[PDB]
Design a protein around this ligand. Structure first.
Ligand SMILES: CC(=O)N[C@@H]1[C@@H](O[C@@H]2OC(C(=O)O)=C[C@H](O)[C@H]2O)[C@@H](O)[C@@H](COS(=O)(=O)O)O[C@H]1O
Length: 377
């Protein structure tokens, strides 16, 4: 299958990355510790429940297992567990997993577009870590739900569930759907200039507004920052399982586009059409996600790629900025790990607030840097 041609911008003023100091072991260790203190405080706050997708005045509310974001909370627990092996974390995370299995068994509030986000960082995660058979059972059931239930750039993250099911079961139909859906996404939800786009917001037969579908990005002519990041991370995750060199070129296109539209402090505004002086809020969650994506792609990028070293310094630059300028410093119940994201600009939700996926990808980025991390995805 082929990926359409896209414009790959060269990376502008690469020295803005190359002259940064790499993050040291001590720096990352301390950012991890600071995050974990907040996490342990939050465990007492949430109990066996979950954070809301985003915070309210930088304090999460507490909710049950019925959003698209619940898995990111469990993912934080597993990530922390990767770091200090505290059985308390795994005890609570496993409770979450049991809740996820109940949720899939009863089809409570399930939308196919979110099955990967829900089940990967929670259930697949535990399976990777200790082989738990209930975590595996929950995962495969989610995968099966996604299969029958089977276009947005987000899906690049969601199909990883399907690659996992293929590996676990040897059933090629999981992989055929994953592969087809990758190419459908790349060719229809990425513009020829490498910017992420949106698929139909309206019924293609009647023009009726689609229920539950939110406007992504400032406008039809702009570039939603988190959408761009879903591509930057989703591509290399998919490349692991596909080995199509075109995917690397597409990653370069989408990544360079992102990097070229970063502001002074290298942390993306919520939409890439905005930079310093706009007065628009940042979306740190987009930046944390891009860091994980670049880190992943760098495992596979050839040593002879003239931009490989720039990408390394770029991700260190962005992560440093998140740690130094955007990470939470007030250790009180309900505070996020990372400040200044935006959930849904157009609906006024989670604008300049912490969000749970932002917290998850920030912690994942730290763990990625600190240890040879075996992917949940
Ligand atoms: C809630 C749900 O199942 N789907 C909608 C949400 O869409 C999710 O958002 C994102 C994202 O990166 O922003 C990634 C997931 O893949 C995607 O399903 C979201 O748009 C919310 C926003 O709520 S709002 O505040 O009312 O705008 O809406 C959901 O319907």
């Amino acid at each position: 299958m082929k990926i359409k041609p896209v414009k790959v911008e060269s990376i502008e003023n690469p020295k803005r990355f190359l002259n940064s100091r790499l993050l040291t072991k001590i720096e990352v260790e301390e950012a991890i510790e600071k995050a974990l203190k907040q996490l342990y405080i939050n465990i007492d706050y949430f109990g066996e429940e979950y954070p809301t997708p985003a915070t309210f005045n930088n304090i999460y509310k507490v909710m049950d297992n019925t959003e698209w974001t619940n898995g990111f909370w469990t993912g934080c627990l597993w990530l922390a567990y990767e770091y200090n092996q505290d059985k308390k974390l795994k005890n609570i995370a496993h409770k979450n997993v049991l809740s996820f299995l109940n949720r899939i068994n009863n089809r409570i509030a399930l939308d196919h577009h979110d099955l990967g986000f829900l089940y990967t960082p929670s259930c697949t995660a535990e399976y990777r870590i200790n082989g738990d058979v209930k975590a595996l059972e929950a995962t495969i059931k989610a995968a099966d739900k996604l299969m029958e239930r089977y276009l947005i750039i987000n899906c690049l993250l969601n199909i990883q569930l399907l690659f996992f099911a293929y590996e676990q079961t040897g059933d090629e139909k999981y992989r055929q759907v994953a592969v087809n859906h990758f190419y459908a996404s790349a060719n229809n939800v990425v513009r020829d200039d490498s910017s992420a786009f949106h698929t139909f917001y309206f019924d293609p037969e009647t023009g009726e507004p689609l229920k539950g579908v939110t406007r992504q990005g400032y406008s039809d002519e702009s570039s939603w920052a988190r959408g761009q990041a879903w591509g930057i991370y989703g591509i290399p995750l998919s490349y692991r399982k596909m080995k199509d060199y075109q995917q690397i070129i597409l990653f370069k296109g989408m990544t360079n586009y992102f990097l070229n539209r970063l502001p002074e402090d290298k942390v993306s505004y919520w939409d890439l059409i905005f930079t310093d002086g706009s007065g628009q809020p940042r979306d740190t969650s987009a930046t944390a996600t891009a860091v994980c994506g670049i880190h992943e792609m760098l495992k596979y990028l050839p040593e002879v790629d003239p931009d490989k070293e720039t990408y390394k310094y770029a991700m260190h630059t962005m992560l440093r900025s998140l740690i130094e300028q955007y990470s939470n410093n007030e250790l009180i119940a309900g505070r996020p790990l990372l400040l200044h994201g935006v959930y849904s600009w157009h609906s006024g939700k989670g604008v300049d607030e912490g969000n749970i996926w932002g917290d998850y990808y920030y912690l994942e980025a730290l763990i990625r840097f600190y240890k040879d991390w075996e992917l949940y995805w």
